[PDB]
C-alpha cells in the first residue's frame, strides 16, 4: 500500500492550511495524523478520520473519503509549524502505513538578524595543549548564515567547522561554529574573530589571547 | 499517567544485533497493545512491530523479513525489540508507543470470533538514538564557557558547558539539575573531521549571579555511561 504527501505547503498566519494524504480507496481505512516538531516525538492529533484526540484545539479537523484524507487547520498560527504525518492500519495484510510526511511553515515570518556568543578556550583545556573557540548563533530567520573566522584579521583556514542550521522551538533558527586549534597556535595571534552573514548584514565577535 | 521510556545500547556493530527495552509505568503491559517505530536522521517514520500485551500475539513490517522480534516481560513490565544482522539503514531514532486497539465481535455458531482494529498511537517514548558503525565509543570532556568581562559587564551573560569529543549520538544537559531551565539552550552537535561530536550548552543568567550563585552543568553520555556534573567556576 501506498501513501502520498506532498512534502510542504505554507500558508499566512490566520489562513487555513490543507494536508492531504492520499491512497487507492484510502476512504475505507481509519485515517490517523500525527505532528512532530523534531527532535520532540510524534503527537497523536485526529484519530478515526476525524475524532480529535484531547487537548487538540476544535480548529484541527479531519475527514476522509475516495482517495484522499484531509487534515485541515483553520486560523493558523506560529504554534502550528511543524511535519505532519498520516497513517493507516491495513487490515488484509496487517501492515501499518505512514505517508512521508508535509512540513507546515507559517508565512511572514519577520527577518531576524542572529545574535553571536563567542567563547576562548577554557584554562582546562589549554593545559592539555588544545584550544577550542566557540560561536554560538541564535534566533535568526531565515535559516540561513555564512559564518568565517579570522585572525588578526586575515581569513582563517582551517580547522573551522559549521553547523547545519537547526529550527528552534520559537521558530527562529540555531547554528554553531568551532575553531579547532592547538595551545601555541591560539597563542600566536592577537585577536580571533567570528563573522556571521545573514541576509546581506554581519555580525562580528572578537577574543583574545 | 502512562510513560514510556526506550533504553539500550547506542552503538551497534554492524551484522550484530540490536536489543532495545521500553520499561513502561503508570499501567501494566498487560492492558494495552505495543508498538515500535522509527525515524532516520532526516526522514519520516516508519513502522516496525507491534505486540498483544497478554496475547503474545505479534505483527511484523513485512519489509523487515526475519530479522525482529518482539516480546513482552510482565515481571518487570517492559517490552523489547531485536533486529538482527543491522547496517547502517537500521540508524536511526527508536520509539516505543501504545497502540489504540478495539475488538469487534461477530456471532458464529460456535461461537463468536473476533476481529481488531487499530487506531493511533499514543504515549509515544521519547525515542532512543541508535547508530550502526564500526567506530568506538567515546565518553565527552567537558569544559567550562566563561563569560567575558565586557559580557559580564552587561546585565545578563551566558555561561556554559562545551562537550568535546564523544561517540556516537547523543548527549542530554541540563543545569544545576534541572532546576535550572529558564534561559537554557543546547545546540545540536557538530561533526568533526576527527570523527568525534561535540556540543555546546549555554544558560542565559543575571550577571549579579556570577560569582555569588553556583552554576553546574549535568552532561549524560549513555553510550558510554558518562555522567559528570561540571562546576562552572566564575
Same mark, same amino acid.
Given at each position: 500500500?501506498?501513501?502520498?504527501?506532498?512534502?510542504?505547503?505554507?500558508?499566512?498566519?490566520?489562513?487555513?492550511?490543507?494536508?492531504?494524504?492520499?491512497?487507492?480507496?484510502?476512504?475505507?481505512?481509519?485515517?490517523?495524523?500525527?505532528?512532530?516538531?523534531?527532535?520532540?516525538?510524534?503527537?497523536?492529533?485526529?484519530?478515526?478520520?476525524?475524532?480529535?484526540?484531547?487537548?487538540?484545539?476544535?480548529? +484541527?479537523?479531519?475527514?476522509?473519503?475516495?482517495?484522499?484524507?484531509?487534515?485541515?487547520? %483553520?486560523? =493558523?498560527? /506560529? $504554534?502550528? #509549524?511543524?511535519?505532519?504525518?498520516?497513517?493507516?492500519?491495513?487490515?488484509?495484510?496487517?501492515?501499518?502505513?505512514?505517508?512521508?510526511?508535509?512540513?507546515?511553515?507559517?508565512?511572514?515570518?519577520?527577518?531576524?538578524?542572529?545574535?553571536?556568543?563567542?567563547?576562548?578556550?577554557?584554562?582546562?583545556?589549554?593545559?592539555?595543549?588544545?584550544?577550542?573557540?566557540?560561536?554560538?548563533?541564535?534566533? +535568526?530567520?531565515?535559516?540561513?548564515?555564512?559564518?568565517?573566522?579570522?585572525?588578526?584579521? %586575515?581569513? =582563517?583556514? /582551517? $580547522?573551522? #567547522?559549521?553547523?547545519?542550521?537547526?529550527?528552534?522551538?520559537?521558530?527562529?533558527?540555531?547554528?554553531?561554529?568551532?575553531?579547532?586549534?592547538?595551545?601555541?597556535?591560539?597563542?600566536?595571534?592577537?585577536?580571533?574573530?567570528?563573522?556571521?552573514?545573514?541576509?546581506?548584514?554581519?555580525?562580528?565577535?572578537?577574543?583574545?589571547? | 499517567?502512562?510513560?514510556?521510556?526506550?533504553?539500550?545500547?547506542?552503538?551497534?556493530?554492524?551484522?550484530?544485533?540490536?536489543?532495545?527495552?521500553?520499561?513502561?509505568?503508570?499501567?501494566?503491559?498487560?492492558?494495552?497493545?505495543?508498538?515500535?517505530?522509527?525515524?532516520?536522521?532526516?526522514?519520516?517514520?516508519?513502522?516496525?512491530?507491534?505486540?498483544?500485551?497478554?496475547?503474545?500475539?505479534?505483527?511484523?513490517?513485512?519489509?523487515?523479513?526475519?530479522?525482529?522480534?518482539?516480546?513482552?516481560?510482565?515481571?518487570?513490565?517492559?517490552?523489547?525489540?531485536?533486529?538482527?544482522?543491522?547496517?547502517?539503514?537500521?540508524?536511526?531514532?527508536?520509539?516505543?508507543?501504545?497502540?489504540?486497539?478495539?475488538?469487534?465481535?461477530?456471532?458464529?455458531?460456535?461461537?463468536?470470533?473476533?476481529?481488531?482494529?487499530?487506531?493511533?498511537?499514543?504515549?509515544?517514548?521519547?525515542?532512543?538514538?541508535?547508530?550502526?558503525?564500526?567506530?568506538?565509543?567515546?565518553?565527552?570532556?567537558?569544559?567550562?564557557?566563561?563569560?567575558?568581562?565586557?559580557?559580564?559587564?552587561?546585565?545578563?551573560?551566558?555561561?556554559?558547558?562545551?562537550?568535546?569529543?564523544?561517540?556516537?549520538?547523543?548527549?542530554?544537559?541540563?543545569?544545576?539539575?534541572?532546576?535550572?531551565?529558564?534561559?537554557?539552550?543546547?545546540?545540536?552537535?557538530?561533526?568533526?573531521?576527527?570523527?568525534?561530536?561535540?556540543?555546546?550548552?549555554?544558560?542565559?543568567?543575571?550577571?549579579?549571579?556570577?560569582?555569588?550563585?553556583?552554576?553546574?552543568?549535568?552532561?549524560?553520555?549513555?553510550?558510554?555511561?558518562?555522567?559528570?556534573?561540571?562546576?562552572?567556576?566564575?
Amino acid at each position: 500500500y501506498d501513501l502520498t504527501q506532498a512534502r510542504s505547503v505554507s500558508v499566512s498566519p490566520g489562513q487555513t492550511a490543507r494536508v492531504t494524504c492520499g491512497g487507492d480507496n484510502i476512504g475505507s481505512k481509519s485515517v490517523q495524523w500525527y505532528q512532530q516538531k523534531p527532535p520532540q516525538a510524534p503527537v497523536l492529533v485526529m484519530s478515526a478520520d476525524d475524532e480529535r484526540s484531547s487537548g487538540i484545539p476544535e480548529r +484541527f479537523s479531519g475527514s476522509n473519503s475516495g482517495n484522499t484524507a484531509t487534515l485541515t487547520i %483553520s486560523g =493558523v498560527e /506560529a $504554534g502550528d #509549524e511543524a511535519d505532519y504525518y498520516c497513517q493507516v492500519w491495513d487490515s488484509s495484510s496487517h501492515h501499518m502505513l505512514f505517508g512521508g510526511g508535509t512540513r507546515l511553515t507559517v508565512l511572514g515570518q519577520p527577518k531576524a538578524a542572529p545574535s553571536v556568543t563567542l567563547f576562548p578556550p577554557s584554562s582546562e583545556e589549554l593545559q592539555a595543549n588544545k584550544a577550542t573557540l566557540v560561536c554560538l548563533i541564535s534566533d +535568526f530567520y531565515p535559516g540561513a548564515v555564512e559564518v568565517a573566522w579570522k585572525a588578526d584579521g %586575515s581569513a =582563517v583556514n /582551517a $580547522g573551522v #567547522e559549521t553547523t547545519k542550521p537547526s529550527k528552534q522551538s520559537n521558530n527562529k533558527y540555531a547554528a554553531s561554529s568551532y575553531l579547532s586549534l592547538t595551545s601555541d597556535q591560539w597563542k600566536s595571534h592577537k585577536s580571533y574573530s567570528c563573522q556571521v552573514t545573514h541576509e546581506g548584514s554581519t555580525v562580528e565577535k572578537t577574543v583574545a589571547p | 499517567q502512562l510513560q514510556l521510556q526506550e533504553s539500550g545500547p547506542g552503538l551497534v556493530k554492524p551484522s550484530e544485533t540490536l536489543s532495545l527495552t521500553c520499561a513502561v509505568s503508570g499501567g501494566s503491559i498487560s492492558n494495552n497493545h505495543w508498538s515500535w517505530i522509527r525515524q532516520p536522521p532526516g526522514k519520516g517514520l516508519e513502522w516496525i512491530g507491534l505486540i498483544s500485551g497478554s496475547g503474545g500475539s505479534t505483527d511484523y513490517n513485512p519489509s523487515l523479513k526475519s530479522r525482529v522480534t518482539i516480546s513482552t516481560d510482565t515481571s518487570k513490565n517492559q517490552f523489547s525489540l531485536k533486529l538482527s544482522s543491522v547496517t547502517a539503514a537500521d540508524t536511526a531514532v527508536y520509539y516505543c508507543a501504545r497502540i489504540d486497539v478495539v475488538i469487534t465481535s461477530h456471532e458464529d455458531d460456535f461461537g463468536d470470533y473476533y476481529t481488531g482494529e487499530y487506531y493511533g498511537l499514543d504515549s509515544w517514548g521519547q525515542g532512543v538514538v541508535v547508530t550502526v558503525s564500526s567506530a568506538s565509543t567515546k565518553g565527552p570532556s567537558v569544559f567550562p564557557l566563561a563569560p567575558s568581562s565586557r559580557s559580564t559587564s552587561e546585565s545578563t551573560a551566558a555561561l556554559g558547558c562545551l562537550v568535546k569529543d564523544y561517540f556516537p549520538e547523543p548527549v542530554t544537559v541540563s543545569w544545576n539539575s534541572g532546576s535550572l531551565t529558564s534561559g537554557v539552550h543546547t545546540f545540536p552537535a557538530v561533526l568533526q573531521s576527527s570523527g568525534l561530536y561535540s556540543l555546546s550548552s549555554v544558560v542565559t543568567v543575571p550577571s549579579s549571579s556570577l560569582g555569588t550563585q553556583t552554576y553546574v552543568c549535568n552532561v549524560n553520555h549513555k553510550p558510554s555511561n558518562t555522567k559528570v556534573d561540571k562546576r562552572v567556576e566564575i
